[PDB]
Write a protein that binds this ligand. Structure first.
Ligand SMILES: *[C@@H]1O[C@H](CO)[C@@H](O[C@@H]2O[C@H](CO)[C@@H](O[C@@H]3O[C@H](CO[C@H]4O[C@H](CO)[C@@H](O)[C@H](O)[C@@H]4O)[C@@H](O)[C@H](O[C@H]4O[C@H](CO)[C@@H](O)[C@H](O)[C@@H]4O)[C@@H]3O)[C@H](O)[C@H]2NC(C)=O)[C@H](O)[C@H]1NC(C)=O
Ligand SMILES: *[C@@H]1O[C@H](CO)[C@@H](O[C@@H]2O[C@H](CO)[C@@H](O[C@@H]3O[C@H](CO[C@H]4O[C@H](CO)[C@@H](O)[C@H](O)[C@@H]4O)[C@@H](O)[C@H](O[C@H]4O[C@H](CO)[C@@H](O)[C@H](O)[C@@H]4O)[C@@H]3O)[C@H](O)[C@H]2NC(C)=O)[C@H](O)[C@H]1NC(C)=O
Ligand SMILES: *[C@@H]1O[C@H](CO)[C@@H](O[C@@H]2O[C@H](CO)[C@@H](O)[C@H](O)[C@H]2NC(C)=O)[C@H](O)[C@H]1NC(C)=O
Ligand SMILES: *[C@@H]1O[C@H](CO)[C@@H](O[C@@H]2O[C@H](CO)[C@@H](O)[C@H](O)[C@H]2NC(C)=O)[C@H](O)[C@H]1NC(C)=O
Ligand SMILES: *[C@@H]1O[C@H](CO)[C@@H](O[C@@H]2O[C@H](CO)[C@@H](O)[C@H](O)[C@H]2NC(C)=O)[C@H](O)[C@H]1NC(C)=O
Ligand SMILES: *[C@@H]1O[C@H](CO)[C@@H](O[C@@H]2O[C@H](CO)[C@@H](O)[C@H](O)[C@H]2NC(C)=O)[C@H](O)[C@H]1NC(C)=O
Ligand SMILES: *[C@@H]1O[C@H](CO)[C@@H](O[C@@H]2O[C@H](CO)[C@@H](O)[C@H](O)[C@H]2NC(C)=O)[C@H](O)[C@H]1NC(C)=O
Ligand SMILES: *[C@@H]1O[C@H](CO)[C@@H](O[C@@H]2O[C@H](CO)[C@@H](O)[C@H](O)[C@H]2NC(C)=O)[C@H](O)[C@H]1NC(C)=O
Ligand SMILES: *[C@@H]1O[C@H](CO)[C@@H](O)[C@H](O)[C@H]1NC(C)=O
Ligand SMILES: *[C@@H]1O[C@H](CO)[C@@H](O)[C@H](O)[C@H]1NC(C)=O
Ligand SMILES: *[C@@H]1O[C@H](CO)[C@@H](O)[C@H](O)[C@H]1NC(C)=O
Ligand SMILES: *[C@@H]1O[C@H](CO)[C@@H](O)[C@H](O)[C@H]1NC(C)=O
Ligand SMILES: *[C@@H]1O[C@H](CO)[C@@H](O)[C@H](O)[C@H]1NC(C)=O
Lengths: 431, 128, 128, 127, 431, 431
């Protein structure tokens, strides 16, 4: 009957804001240094229905920018390997090559001859090759840009990080155990911070993620579009154990006034290729279930899991990081199956030291070695597939765009600005 | 705690929003404040929050509702905005749904509120 | 719209000012964000604007004019400030010209408004 | 001038601090963009604004808005302080009183909030 | 009778603030990315008189700082030409010299011999000169400081720039035709933003400016003082077409890991001096009118237009930029006249590649060449004259201090802070 | 009887905030450009008792951070002496070595032989020593960092510094003479800014400080702990005149494109060691008084003043920077006495040019020479002693942690936030 103004009204709008990181010499501990509340309260909003859309979610963009930002900042004060773009002379080890080069010393009027083992992937043949003989070579991606050494004292091990909303905003979490990305959700709950999200960098297979509560969920922006990436959230993990067996002996040298360069001085014992053992029975079960789900989404079609096409190494292999060692594994032996609706697997892996992260050109990183052999037990929790696009559907491993990885953990969350000012009718005037 | 009783019967929510509003008291790190562009972004977020709070407070003050979480006004309700005589509004309807209902009329209502206070202010200086 | 009816008297303009204070409310209530020194400049400008607005609001509150765009006060006008008995002030003189007229006594009037309102507050606390 | 009549007594300071505040009106280079100092000043400034607004919000919520002195509707409970109108406006000063009733500040704030809630509810219901 | 407090009072004070830029890979588009209002409303303040002063205007200083900072930030990431400060062996071209030098490459232990055409202005000898034979020179400005290559993909072409006031401030614009720059203005308007101002960098002649509404306007801080620069706003433009006819062939090399250096590899055909053709009749009429105006301001004096004195090249020539090509034109043939109160002109022009902008030392810029020939037309709207200071007045072309140029566009505008709080007597009492 | 809310209450709490500097080219004048009030006002609080604690005072931390940051920012745009990390063929000055080296020039394909006199402390041998003959050495700290030259045009002369509180805070000052540093202060006042503090950098002896008003004051966090540093505030100064008698002739060279390196080209006349003359009788009286006060604090003990133990040079000598010269003086001759409760002193001093400030490793500074001899007169207003920790107490000169210097001036001050909102009972309700 009469207008009335209320303040403190529970009304919100979709909005974008800079969420601040908080977690309970790691870069993810220096950043995200804000502590998290013990037992953060989740308030369930009864009868509230909210439209979620995991794609076009600004939280994913913020996480992408924050992740690369920390990596770039963390590499800023480190040693630039500009003195090491010189002629190497490599002659095989009595995959890996025993290169030799004249590196600079702290004194400008001095040089030092250095013998270092470099992976063949990290080198470019400057001169014609020569089998056992020593040929001239150069470090890869030198001409593109200077190579910055990742600091040995700074570790990039992922830790669970929570993205908290600033004051005046809130986060809405969908609590539906089977909910495709873009659509309404009935079971919404308000929160101040996300769950513990580990920013694990990988391709093809999502590692150390969060398992789906219900079945295996297939989320894709446009399934009928063959350009979009399908994200498969698994409801059960699969164990994969990665390992570099080589027993490295790591040396160091001074390439400047306080600039230390760490390289693989030697390998003790036999030289063997790195590999990943994934549990066979669990993998076969997982692929069968994913095939049935894809058949449900793609009726009257045979579901073929094949190897990726012949692109670059960074995009045709399961790439990941284990204690700073950068593995690229050939998962062709895994995606080698077919579902018709009508004892470990060993995966060879190459290892690189000169890395071009985030699909960028002109910013390379040198990942120094680690003495000894290396092992990492990671849980595969999700897959990144791409439909080739016949009466048969071909799904290949995908990835490369790290956005999807962040989205794989941020599909639940939405950011909303609170509009406390509201107007409603009442039964009385001002007077 | 921000959105307690959301989607929850504006009558009940208003029984809570005034109680919670006073209870909530919502609104008003050297690495993250000196290294990189983190600090500038925190400052931008905080300044934007202050600006939005001051915008809401200014709108309350212009309408004569300064310092009040609930304030009746001299603007009578026009049925052209909504034709529901408290049956759904304080009954089956929620604050979010109600906001969706009068999303198109809101600016118009503000003008009337604004206009009303003008008259009162003029009257305030004419009766004295 | 900021300076509408400027230099157009104040007796006639006063209606336009009451209208502007609702239509305009007030002026104060990417590459240019985190690249170079332009972001810090924008932050300084915004913070200074907020500070000036809060200074004006605090002055209004201290005088008992809180939440009022027009407020009569209990301070009688002293002819030592101006000897125009509404003849040219609201008849022929503009707000800018009037500001020039009493630029030297504005602070004194602020003191009188403060003292008067302070006494009022004490009288109210004694009466209750 | 900020802490004028500190120590002394609450009564003298209360009247004076109102006139003192009536006068102080407290609450509201290369360094602008050289080094971290340009950031630091803003953190010194923005934070101050926030603190000021927080106090104002309390005044808003207790109906003390635009009033340096504001009698409320909450009766005083002797459990907070045994003395009353003897030293609290006699020999005691504001610092001692502050650290005396610092134990119950949240309780007082909740009671004032409840009183203003009831006041607003009565205002809308009795109108 | 009783004090009354008003808020929203239309009263303002002269104040300084940081005006934010706006405009409808250009540096002026990246910066000034804020869009402008379609049809920006101009409110005329009736019966308002305001004291404008084009001199001592903080807007001019702010625009000077913004232009300087934008240029520096744009040249910040571009290639530094430190490796190219080496001995050059230059031997004339079968003005321009064919210089040979050993540049660096992406490999620290490699060099590359490079033949590049350099203007003689950009070179200073190291030992002797031998007419026909070659001799050893170096680039100028190396001894003073380093040299940064302007990014070839980043263009500094001016666009209309609007300087918008922030919240709580307004820009008063003086509409009085024939406003002499410092007196009171009896016809003002209020705006949020200025008109489209092109930040054109030039000397002597103002190009692509705003024409005066009335007749030609002579504005100076103190006409009786001979050290101040007279700014002449023309009410009619004069067409000047400036061209570099040399048909260059532009090469490039890598002087580092991703550092590309662009130089003039060759000139195809004949080598000819660059020149500016200015329309003769329009120029003669313009100078006659300017002389008449100066005679009005300087009675009983013969008005002599003579060439500048024998200073440096940057201050004795019409300097300007055309597609990043830096011309310096000998405009003595234009200012070669005399007014007594009682068919194109061709101007030769030199071109430089190593530029010291903003009258600064310690910072130099290398402007890369452009393949092909260059032409451009720039309307002349303003003149920067200096009175020599006899029964005769000698006016020479001036400039060098860039603020005057932007002052020629910002003479109209004045920034004012609004003071909404006011006090007035009323019969009303609080009671 | 009824709750009442007051605003503007004079109540405060201990709080930490960033204090903005103030002072009535010099780095301390460039920074702290905020002017100070004429006749700063001090308001004494009657019957107010406040707990001060000069240790764990955030003002000391802020002054430490600000001094280090200002020193670093002042050295940021200066010349990096990376080209001088080369072999030096040092013979002998006809303590000081006559070192020859091939420095670089503005051209990357040129070198210049340079003869420079370097102190032996600033040099580390590379191969053997030969008495009369020359040997190859290198500059110290060449193999740890790049040495930045302190700019000759930028002076670090201390000036009085006033640290002021932002709005909403105040600085309480304790007026109680003989205040022992941590107890309650029964005579306090409020101020906006502190007294003029000269940020003088020194060890062992505090120079150009503030004299205690009463007697000599001994302040230490825990006197019975032998690890803490005792600060002795003297109530009477002692004159010390430090001088470098060498008559230097200072040359300069270009080590790059606009990089100027200043070094001691020659010494005219005799070479003599620098020295400090401290007034003998005043020093003996001062040490007798300090011994008496320590005996009061340490009853039944003989008070022995002995020289520091055999640590590094920077921590076993009185270190200071008279003019632009960094002197390290062997003050064992001063602390060579014993107090039993039952005519100048000449101190030799070494001088360094390569300086490591605040115990930092990885950042070194080259202090250029000042042509001619150098002399300075400072007043010893304080001592930094350390109890060795028998029936006898051994007190040695201390220092090295520069906070103890700036805690010697900021002991009086305490930052407090004002809490203007308060509550109190009254005799009436709102009604
Ligand atoms: C999915 O999640 C798993 C589990 O978190 C990850 O696997 C872990 O990865 C971390 C880091 O990559 C491993 O932590 C490292 O372990 C090394 C070996 O630890 C064993 O041996 C040492 C012997 O010293 C024992 O003390 C220890 O208890 C273990 O028995 C350590 O040597 C490492 O320390 C070195 O690095 C750290 C920084 O990382 C430094 O601070 C140290 O000083 C030292 O230099 C380090 O602690 C962990 O062991 C792994 N666990 C398992 C079970 O594999 C996966 O990596 C993750 N998935 C992906 C893709 O990353
Ligand atoms: C006063 O105002 C006049 C009028 O604006 C100015 O003169 C004009 O200046 C503009 C800008 O320099 C000229 O416009 C055109 O600029 C194009 C931009 O080239 C960039 O992009 C290409 C794309 O790859 C790059 O390769 C290149 O390096 C640049 O980064 C040019 O491409 C235009 O070239 C001409 O040839 C092409 C084909 O080669 C044609 O297709 C075009 O249409 C065009 O004819 C051209 O340079 C414009 O030509 C100038 N004249 C006129 C009459 O507009 C004055 O410069 C200004 N005063 C001052 C002092 O600056
Ligand atoms: C993960 O999801 C899959 C698919 O929903 C579950 O596998 C099915 O489980 C049901 C219940 O026993 C069986 O009837 C089906 O035959 C299984 N396969 C398929 C393709 O549906 C699996 O149990 C889930 N994981 C859990 C619960 O841990
Ligand atoms: C990974 O191993 C797979 C399986 O061999 C390779 O895929 C094909 O291998 C066959 C030979 O077995 C070749 O003839 C094809 O050219 C290969 N196609 C590609 C490029 O996938 C593959 O070469 C190996 N490399 C990857 C993709 O990691
Ligand atoms: C899907 O995979 C199946 C096998 O899992 C493919 O079947 C093969 O068909 C080819 C025809 O040339 C035969 O040579 C092979 O023997 C079959 N099996 C094997 C071992 O691959 C089938 O071609 C695939 N379909 C698509 C379109 O991907
Ligand atoms: C004096 O002011 C009047 C406005 O009061 C000017 O007239 C119009 O002004 C508007 C806005 O500035 C323009 O859009 C119109 O084009 C103007 N009309 C005409 C006919 O000029 C007038 O030009 C001003 N005159 C001077 C000399 O300043
Ligand atoms: C620009 O101003 C000049 C005067 O400085 C104008 O030239 C005069 O124009 C009038 C016509 O109104 C002629 O009678 C005069 O002979 C011209 N010369 C002089 C010296 O007055 C010119 O018309 C103006 N042009 C524009 C476009 O406004
Ligand atoms: C500085 O302090 C010393 C020690 O307290 C003072 O020296 C004493 O002065 C008194 C005179 O008041 C003499 O009777 C004593 O013999 C002196 N020595 C001692 C050990 O007490 C000195 O006077 C003070 N000076 C100032 C300027 O305050
Ligand atoms: C809904 O969400 C709540 C809280 O997140 C959860 O406990 C429950 O299992 C979910 N399922 C329902 C009831 O929809
Ligand atoms: C997801 O389901 C919704 C229905 O809620 C449907 O509209 C949409 O097409 C599906 N795909 C996505 C991920 O949007
Ligand atoms: C993508 O989504 C649109 C939505 O309208 C749909 O029409 C289309 O079939 C989908 N697939 C492709 C390949 O566009
Ligand atoms: C894939 O399976 C087929 C079954 O015929 C086998 O022949 C082939 O070796 C397998 N290849 C991979 C990549 O595992
Ligand atoms: C030291 O004390 C003497 C004597 O009081 C005084 O003249 C001089 O200015 C003071 N300052 C210094 C450091 O010499």
């Amino acid at each position: 009957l009469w207008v009335t103004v209320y303040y403190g009204v529970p009304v919100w709008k979709d909005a974008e804001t800079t969420l601040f990181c908080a977690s309970d010499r790691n870069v993810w501990a220096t950043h995200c240094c804000v502590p998290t509340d013990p037992n953060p309260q989740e308030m369930v909003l009864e009868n509230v229905t909210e439209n979620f859309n995991m794609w076009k979610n600004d939280m994913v963009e913020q996480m992408h920018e924050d992740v690369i930002s920390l990596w770039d900042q963390s590499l800023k004060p480190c040693v630039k390997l500009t003195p090491l773009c010189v002629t190497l002379e490599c002659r095989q080890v009595n995959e890996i090559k025993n290169c030799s080069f004249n590196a600079t010393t702290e004194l400008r009027d001095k040089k030092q001859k250095v013998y270092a083992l470099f992976y063949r992937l990290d080198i470019v043949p400057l001169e014609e090759e020569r089998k056992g003989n020593s040929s001239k070579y150069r470090l890869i991606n030198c001409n593109t840009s200077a190579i910055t050494q990742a600091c040995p004292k700074v570790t990039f091990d992922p830790i669970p990080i929570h993205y908290c909303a600033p004051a005046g905003y809130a986060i809405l979490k969908c609590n539906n155990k089977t909910f495709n990305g873009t659509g309404p959700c009935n079971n919404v709950s308000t929160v101040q911070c996300t769950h513990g999200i580990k920013p694990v960098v990988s391709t093809q297979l999502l590692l150390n993620g969060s398992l789906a509560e219900g079945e295996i969920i297939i989320r894709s922006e446009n399934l009928t579009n063959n350009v979009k990436t399908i994200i498969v959230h698994l409801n059960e993990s699969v164990e994969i154990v990665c390992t570099r067996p080589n027993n490295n002996t790591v040396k160091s040298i001074r390439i400047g006034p306080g600039q230390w360069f760490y390289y693989t001085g030697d390998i003790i014992g036999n030289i063997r290729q790195a590999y990943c053992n994934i549990k066979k029975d669990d993998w076969i079960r997982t692929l069968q279930r994913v095939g049935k789900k894809l058949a449900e989404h793609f009726p009257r079609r045979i579901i073929n899991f094949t190897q990726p096409a012949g692109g670059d190494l960074e995009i045709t292999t399961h790439s990941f990081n284990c204690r700073g060692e950068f593995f690229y594994c050939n998962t062709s032996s895994l995606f080698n199956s077919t579902y018709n609706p009508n004892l470990d697997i060993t995966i060879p892996c190459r290892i690189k030291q000169i890395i071009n992260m985030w699909q960028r050109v002109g910013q390379a990183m040198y990942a120094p070695p680690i003495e000894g052999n290396i092992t990492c037990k990671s849980n595969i929790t999700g897959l990144l597939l791409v439909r080739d696009g016949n009466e048969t559907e071909i799904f290949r491993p995908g990835g490369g765009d790290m956005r999807n990885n962040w989205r794989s953990e941020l599909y639940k969350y939405k950011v909303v600005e609170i509009k406390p000012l509201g107007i409603a009718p009442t039964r009385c005037k001002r007077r | 705690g921000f959105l307690g009783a959301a989607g929850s019967t504006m009558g009940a929510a208003s029984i809570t929003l005034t109680v919670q509003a006073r209870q909530l008291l919502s609104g008003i790190q050297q690495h993250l404040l000196q290294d990189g562009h983190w600090g500038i972004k925190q400052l931008q977020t905080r300044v934007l929050a202050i600006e939005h709070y001051l915008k809401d407070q200014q709108l309350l003050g212009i309408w004569g509702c300064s310092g009040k979480l609930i304030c009746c006004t001299a603007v009578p309700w026009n049925s052209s905005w909504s034709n529901k005589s408290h049956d759904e509004i304080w009954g089956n309807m929620t604050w979010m749904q109600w906001d969706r209902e009068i999303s198109n009329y809101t600016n118009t209502i503000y003008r009337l509120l604004e206009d009303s206070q003008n008259q009162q202010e003029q009257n305030e200086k004419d009766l004295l």
